[PDB]
Amino acid sequence: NDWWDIPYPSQFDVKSLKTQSFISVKGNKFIDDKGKTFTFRGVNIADTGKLLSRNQWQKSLFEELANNWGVNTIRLPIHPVSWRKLGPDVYLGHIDEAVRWANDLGIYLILDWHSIGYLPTEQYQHPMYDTTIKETRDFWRRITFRYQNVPTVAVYELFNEPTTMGNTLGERNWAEWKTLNESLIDMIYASDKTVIPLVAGFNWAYDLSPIKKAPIEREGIAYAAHPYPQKAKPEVKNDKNFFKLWDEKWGFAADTYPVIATQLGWVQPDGYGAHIPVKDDGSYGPRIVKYMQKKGVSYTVWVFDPDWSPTMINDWDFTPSEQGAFFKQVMLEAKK
Amino acid sequence: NDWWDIPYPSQFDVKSLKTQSFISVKGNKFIDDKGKTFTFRGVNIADTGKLLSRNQWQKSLFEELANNWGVNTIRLPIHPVSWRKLGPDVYLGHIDEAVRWANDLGIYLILDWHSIGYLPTEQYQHPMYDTTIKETRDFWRRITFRYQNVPTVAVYELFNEPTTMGNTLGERNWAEWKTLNESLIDMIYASDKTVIPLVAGFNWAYDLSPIKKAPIEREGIAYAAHPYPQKAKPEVKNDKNFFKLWDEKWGFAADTYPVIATQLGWVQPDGYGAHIPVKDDGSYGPRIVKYMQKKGVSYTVWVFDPDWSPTMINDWDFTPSEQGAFFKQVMLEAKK
Amino acid sequence: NDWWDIPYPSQFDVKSLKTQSFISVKGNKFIDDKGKTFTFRGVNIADTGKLLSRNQWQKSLFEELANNWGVNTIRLPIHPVSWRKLGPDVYLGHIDEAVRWANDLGIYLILDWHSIGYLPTEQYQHPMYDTTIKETRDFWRRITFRYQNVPTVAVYELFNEPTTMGNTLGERNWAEWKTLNESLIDMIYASDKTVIPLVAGFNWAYDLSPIKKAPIEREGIAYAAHPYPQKAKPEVKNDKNFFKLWDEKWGFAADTYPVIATQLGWVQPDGYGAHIPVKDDGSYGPRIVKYMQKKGVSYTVWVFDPDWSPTMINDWDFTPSEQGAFFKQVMLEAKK
Ligand SMILES: OC[C@H]1O[C@@H](O[C@@H]2[C@@H](O)[C@H](O[C@H]3[C@H](O)[C@@H](O)[C@H](O[C@H]4[C@H](O)[C@@H](O)[C@H](O)O[C@@H]4CO)O[C@@H]3CO)O[C@H](CO)[C@H]2O)[C@H](O)[C@@H](O)[C@@H]1O
Ligand SMILES: OC[C@H]1O[C@@H](O[C@@H]2[C@@H](O)[C@H](O[C@H]3[C@H](O)[C@@H](O)[C@H](O[C@H]4[C@H](O)[C@@H](O)[C@H](O)O[C@@H]4CO)O[C@@H]3CO)O[C@H](CO)[C@H]2O)[C@H](O)[C@@H](O)[C@@H]1O
Ligand SMILES: OC[C@H]1O[C@@H](O[C@@H]2[C@@H](O)[C@H](O[C@H]3[C@H](O)[C@@H](O)[C@H](O[C@H]4[C@H](O)[C@@H](O)[C@H](O)O[C@@H]4CO)O[C@@H]3CO)O[C@H](CO)[C@H]2O)[C@H](O)[C@@H](O)[C@@H]1O
Ligand SMILES: [Cl-]
Ligand SMILES: [Cl-]
Ligand SMILES: [Cl-]
Ligand SMILES: [Cl-]
Ligand SMILES: [Cl-]
Ligand SMILES: [Cl-]
Ligand SMILES: [Mg+2]
Ligand SMILES: [Mg+2]
Ligand SMILES: [Mg+2]
User: Fold this and answer.
1) Does any CB of chain B come closer than 8 Å to the CB of residue C84?
2) Bridge partners, residue C202, by sequence
3) A56 touches chain C (CB under 8 A)
4) Phi first, then psi: what are they for C240, rounded to 5°?
5) Which of A166, C38, C83, C236 is a good FRET partner for B187, with 20 to 30 A between their CA atoms?
6) Which other chains touch chain A, taking contact as 3+ CB pairs less than 8 Å apart?
7) Contact at 8 Å (CB) between B246 and B291?
8) Which value, to the nearest 10 degrees, does the dihedral of the CA atoms of residues C183, C184, C188, C194 take?
9) Is B174 exposed, middle or buried (0-12, 13-18, 19+ CB in 10 A)?
10) Tally of CB atoms within 10 A around B290
11) Is the preceding peptide bond at A303 cis, omega within 30 degrees of 0?
12) DSSP letter for each residue of B29-74
């Protein structure tokens, strides 16, 4: 009504949660607050607004994943268009639901500001990802305040997929991107020092190689990787050659910092919603899992949804897709 | 209708005003155009839009202040949300009213772009204060053009209360803020060299100390200070200790440049709309007045409104509040 | 409907066009792809949205110009307010029409992002020109993608008229403007290397003199000039004195780079829609044409419209205005 009476914001009520360990960074590993090494293992679900539109934003979704798919983590890809469409207040109210659901089940959330493009020039792959530096800062300001001292919310993934699309969106420049990530980290750490910022490299969060010489100059962070099957292109398709290429671009990072592969997965080239870079004959599955397990790398498969591809499920009865069936058994075995 | 026919803007008609002295900066003082030392002494009123909503935007308001409260100055806190809500054209049309009313009564206006936060990152304490560098420049561009050669409009207070809220809004950086103020000053001086820009420091316009080594590198400006009672926190509460702390952070500035305390005031801790940093037992009143009178510091008390706190009045019949009664007698005595 | 289903954009179908030479830059000249020196000679028409509003956006308009006025070029001044009003999708669909019409007639288009002001501070002469760096980049991103490999679209005129209006809009700074143009060029060249970027100087695209020491550091570009009659102000009004002043500020550029005078023209001081800087007794016409022909300078007269001034026509039956009659004969003679 009267703009001067608009309330100041409130923080999530931590008393509403059951006891749950905080996850933290220690050297190249995540650890829980009992000191035990921890690996994020789980899935993406679709944007909250997408799920709400078909009445699929429900605790039953989290229960299925925790109880039947072996997950300890769900990644929420918050699309800026949806953040605007629902509005911050309403969107945050739904994130609160996810927090309570995850907490009840003893699982963790990665909050992902889900854009694709080059934030320093504010140019993007598609309008669903459109944002500004101002809006991006404000999202992280609001999130960090609201979820202060909440162990369930473990990771703040600052910007899903940095890319300039062959420099059509701007001139990719590591120093500039590094500085902007450091700026976001500083805002976050000023508000909550317990959360783990997750930083991505260029080429759609595939190339971490700039961190060899110029890593982000902040402690307690982890690095993202999106090792989709068609990103590495060896002439001879075997474990050794893929492993070497992955090592060069992103895997080396796990020697020094924790790494979360926050997107990975495949569909057959003639399968549902097939597109570059997610097409594969299936051999990628065992290979990427072997690689990640060798390096202790964390992961959230894309995507546990029957509409968005590559799918893990064929329907809302959770009939597994090819990749779904594969990762389900991997996660169930890892949980044991 | 057709965007190509939208008129270019017009300037305030100076022929509509009665003769009134221009106020200017000379060394550490303000002077009128007869050469006599001048002190701004007055009050804030509420945002124009707030007053309009209850039909309280009236000349009778200015008349009460000039005739009965001893003021020579009114500060208008133009909130960006209200600037947008009324629209520039309509808001400026109401500022024109204030100009004619003030001019008729021989009093002056401070125009305050009333935001709280960190403009370089475009992050703010509350959405009522939300703005951008672009909108802020445009506000000053429009204001400076419209009120060219108008003596009644004396001071352009560029940004009410700079703060990063413990670096949650961004990393406070004096060089960056100094440069941005210099940029705004350059736009203003390109359009009207007679106006006085008023520059604020960090910690909600409390800390001017960076100007000891790095003052804004422009002539004819003054500095703002917001010495609310709870800003200085001496262990022993007496004149000497408060004076020393005020000296350290803002009072020293008055030795070299003119200073306007554009917000100050108090309410009892159990009084109406009490909040940090405006709570005091009342002893602050005599103390801040003694301090300002000693240093020749100008001031506008916050706020001459019965709804917005700390109030100077309890109702629209102008029943004085505690601080209202106090400052009313101070201003009346100073006017004599 | 559902934002995740919003289509990715498509490119203009080059198979829809008849064969037409590409125009390119070679040293200080334009050449066609047969190697012959080429001069752009033509007119501006009004903004597409302006023409649509009165049902004047028609192929008949292009046919009149190509068949009866001797043009080989039409400049389209795309106003940001109109880009927003129609929306990118609809505006681009109308530009597609112009492409097909021009191509059919064997003539070329200059696409002009038609703003006036200082892009680095995002401050402008009038709201019809209002834009941001983000919107400007996005316009060029969309344009370059859509018209890839289209010979008909020859020139991308990045920003119509740079000016700070006496530094009221910001502090003019060549290094800053040069860098921003280079940034836009890099985005464009990443998407289509065949197009010709057209760069403007300060003082409403009049002053190219900064390029003597600090030219844009990219190949294949041309420079704009807007030599309106009142821009040069010799005390003695003859060819020699105007030529010298034009030489100093913009004409020298044609010695080293190709130049397009993308706005020029006049109306009598007591004529229709007369204003600075377009007022002249008519002697300017022969003088500017003589000057341009001497230097091999390309041009598009402002403006072939009966409402927008200075006009080339008095009505939609194409009754020529004074300047219209003059330039019509110049262009017809040049075409022969
Ligand atoms: O396009 C060629 C280039 O592709 C590059 O890979 C991109 C890839 O990283 C990206 O991965 C994710 C997106 O992050 C995610 O948003 C998207 O979700 C879609 C979903 O696929 C649709 O079914 C649904 O309707 O809408 C959602 C919207 O979020 O899922 C993909 C993984 O499938 O996807 C984009 C295209 O969407 C890829 O462009 C690659 O890195 C380059 O090498 C390549 O040139
Ligand atoms: O919040 C803790 C921190 O407070 C810091 O002080 C801030 C103070 O400087 C600021 O002063 C003014 C505002 O500038 C002014 O906008 C506000 O007006 C309110 C009014 O109080 C309400 O009654 C009304 O409904 O809405 C108007 C909107 O303009 O009045 C205050 C003075 O009372 O106020 C803010 C809070 O509003 C303070 O945060 C302090 O500097 C820090 O040390 C402290 O940590
Ligand atoms: O104003 C004083 C200053 O004028 C400066 O010249 C400007 C001049 O370059 C500019 O040229 C073009 C504009 O680019 C173009 O947009 C405008 O179109 C108008 C048209 O004139 C109207 O009839 C119509 O209704 O609306 C369109 C909107 O696009 O046409 C002019 C040429 O006539 O025009 C502006 C004013 O419109 C000039 O300010 C000059 O360079 C300075 O020296 C001078 O101080
Ligand atoms: Cl990239
Ligand atoms: Cl594909
Ligand atoms: Cl601060
Ligand atoms: Cl309080
Ligand atoms: Cl200029
Ligand atoms: Cl004029
Ligand atoms: Mg947390
Ligand atoms: Mg004035
Ligand atoms: Mg082309």
Assistant:
1) no
2) C207
3) no
4) -55, -50
5) C83
6) B, C
7) yes
8) -100
9) middle
10) 13
11) yes
12) EEEETTS-EE--EEEE---HHHHHHTT--SHHHHHHHHHHS--SEE
Q: Which of C53, C128, C170 sits opposite B6 (nearest CB)?
A: C128
* DSSP codes, C58-123: SHHHHHHHHHHS--SEEEEEE-HHHHHHH-HHHHHHHHHHHHHHHHHHT-EEEEEE--EEEGGGTE
Q: Is C67 on the interface with B (CB under 8 A)?
A: no
Buried b (16+ CB within 10 A) or exposed e, B85-109: ebebeebbebbbebbbbbbbbebbb
Ordered by where they begin, the domains of chain A are 1-336 (3.20.20.80)
Q: Which residues 212-251 of C have a C-beta within 8 angstroms of A?
A: none
- Residue of C89, C184, C187 to mutate when probing chain A, most A C-beta within 10 A: C187
Nearest residue (CA) to ligand 2, atom 29: A4
CA dist., res. A118 & res. A133, Å (int) = 10
Tell me, rounded to whole angstroms, the distance of Cα C124 from its chain centroid: 18
Among candidate residues A78, A114, A117, the one with its CA nearest the CA of residue A98: A78
Cα B332 to chain centroid distance, Å, stands at 20
Max intra-chain CA distance, chain B = 67
Q: Is the four-CA dihedral A284, A285, A286, A290 of positive or negative sign? A: positive
The dihedral sign for the CA sequence A212, A218, A220, A225: negative
Q: How were these coordinates obtained?
A: X-ray
Number of helical (H) and strand (E) elements in chain C, helices listed first: 10, 14
Residues with Cβ < 8 Å from A167, sequence gap 6 or more?
A: C186, C187, C190
Resolution of the experimental model, in Å, one decimal: 1.9
Helix/strand/coil for A210: helix
CB < 8 Å to A183, chain B: 121, 170-171
In the chain, the amino acid numbered A106 is G
At C11, phi and psi to the nearest 5? -95, 150
User: Strand pairing partners for C116?
Assistant: C161
**DSSP H helical ranges for A106-132:** none
Query: Helix, strand, or coil here: B319?
Result: coil
Please name every residue paired with B301 in a beta bridge, in sequence order, or none if there are none.
B43
3-state class (DSSP) for residue B89: helix
Residue A275 CB: number of other CB atoms within 10 A? 11
C-alpha A334/C-alpha B309 separation (Å) is 59
Distance from CA of A176 to the nearest CA of C (A): 14
Q: How far apart are CA A140 and CA A183, in angstroms?
A: 11
Which strand (E) or helix (H) includes residue B135? helix B133-146
B168, two tokens: 């949650």
- CB A121 within 8 Å of CB A77: no
Q: Dmax over Cα atoms in chain A, in whole Å?
A: 67
C228 in Cβ contact with C265 (< 8 Å): yes
CB B324 within 8 A of CB B65: no
Residue B151: phi, psi to the nearest 5? Answer: -65, -30
CA nearest to A1 within chain B: B53
Tokens found for residue C104: 């059919």
List the beta bridge partners of residue B224.
B260
Q: Tokens 């046919």 — which residue?
A: C63
Half-sphere exposure for A58 (CA within 13 Å, toward CB): 9
To the question of whether residue B81 is assigned a binding role by annotation, the answer is no
Chain C hits for B144, CB-CB cut-off 8 Å, are: 168
Q: Which of C91, C175, C186, C90 is nearest to C137 (CA)?
A: C186
Question: DSSP class of residue B19?
Answer: P
DSSP readout, B154-195? Answer: EEEE--SEE--TTTTSS---HHHHHHHHHHHHHHHHHH-TTS
